[model samples]
Target: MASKRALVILAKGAEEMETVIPVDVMRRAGIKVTVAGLAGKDPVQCSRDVVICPDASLEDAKKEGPYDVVVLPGGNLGAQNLSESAAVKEILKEQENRKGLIAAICAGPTALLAHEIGFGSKVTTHPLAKDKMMNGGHYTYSENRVEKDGLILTSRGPGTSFEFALAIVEALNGKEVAAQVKAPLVLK
Candidate 1:
């Protein structure tokens, strides 16, 4: 089987852990993961000052689609940047239309709201983001560490990132691969 491809968008101020954990785990599952910078093709300075060079600019990466999944990682400012992007909105809309997997963590789910994707699905975000996530009553909220409803998958803050990424691996690959990958991590 061809490796499943994923596009992970990284904006300035994105949560470093949320962004890295998923990318790392998916690669461990033999998935092709593209970490795309939301800005131009440059290094992004994450929330904790961790800097990363993306595989490509979002503009460049979009042309490499259609990906099996699109991932969003969160920081309040990063999510705001993602939410304000017309390009991000368009990519998300197309992903949703194709019924492709769309995953977000922490405030990242708020970007889904900005794009008007997956309304009415059970979702969750960092507790602080709940109000913004539930704004306009577009979707129902959940307290799950990780929530997967149809094509949309969401997770809480940094602490749940591993669970979130593993869920994504399970969705794209299989339970076997996800578990095999998880076993090496020694996660509780």
Candidate 2:
């Protein structure tokens, strides 16, 4: 009964590290995680040209929602690509409507900004994306590696992915579970 589900949407040019780290850590914490390809069920080519196949397409995964968390990984073009999707829009708004946790890292938060999901929340993104994230005076901003405003979670660049994932693990499981996962990683 403690099982939790998570959906991570994947689009072109995503930061490989940010995408992989959270997915890996979430599974280690025993959450049920799905990597949803924004496009379709094919190998997604990431920003650094690294590729990873998603477990399912967004069309396929959205039906599985009301997950404990919805994650968005970042890359400039990646987040922009997610920003342009009607599917991504629907999912975010639905998740927000349910008051479920929505976590976005680096440029990933830009999609939340674009879709008008987390207004009145405090957020942070990759430094280069500060201007885009600030566009409509919707939310406060932070410089911390991770920032959580109610159900919205935002974090900095690739370097912060570990902390970001643990935040997810902590939110769903508890601090002790997060610590258990963190301890083995020898993260500094």
Candidate 3:
């Protein structure tokens, strides 16, 4: 079987944990993961002040072709940056049209709203972002810690990062690989 590839887009002020957990867990599942910086190839200062050097710039990464999944991690400022990116909007639209997976956590779902993707699908976001995420009532809201309605997968916040990452692993690799990867993580 061909290996699955994931693209994780990071912007300044993104939640450090939300960004790391998914990338780490997805790599554990043996999926090829690319961490793309929103601005440039420079290191990004995360919401909690942790610095991350992305594998490449978003502009450079997009040239790599269609990824199996495109992940968005939330921090209010980070989501705002993502929502403002014309590039992100294009990526989301293309991914949605291709029926590819697009996962977002916390305020991350609001980016999806900004891009006008996944309308009519059941989704969830951080409690504080509910209003923003529901702007047009384009999507049905849920309280699920990890909600997967078709190609759109979303999770609540930092507390749910592990579940969110594991869910991505399951979607790409299968339940068996997800379980194998989860075992060593010792998650309850």
| lDDT by candidate, in order shown | 0.97, 0.95, 0.97
Look at candidate 2 and give me any clashing residue pairs. Answer: none
State which candidate has the highest lDDT. Answer: 1
Reference-based TM-score, model 2? 0.98
For candidate 3, the 10 contiguous residues with the lowest summed lDDT are 179-188
Residues 45-164 of candidate 1 have per-residue lDDT tens digits of: 999999999999999999999999999999999999999999999999999999899999999999999989999999999999999999999999999999999999999999999999
lDDT of 3 by residue, 1-188 (tens): 98999999999999999999999999999999999999989999999999999999999999996999999999999999999999999999999999999999999999999989999999999999999999979999999999999999999999999999999999999999999999999887
Clashing pairs in 3: none
RMSD of each: 0.5, 0.7, 0.6
Off by over 4 Å in 2: none
| Candidate 3 whole-model C-alpha lDDT, 0 to 1 | 0.97
Q: How far is candidate 3 from the true structure (C-alpha RMSD, Å)?
A: 0.6
- Model 3 regions more than 4 Å off: none
- Evaluation by lDDT, superior candidate among 2 and 3: 3
Model 2 per-residue lDDT at 150? 90
lDDT of 2 at 159: 97
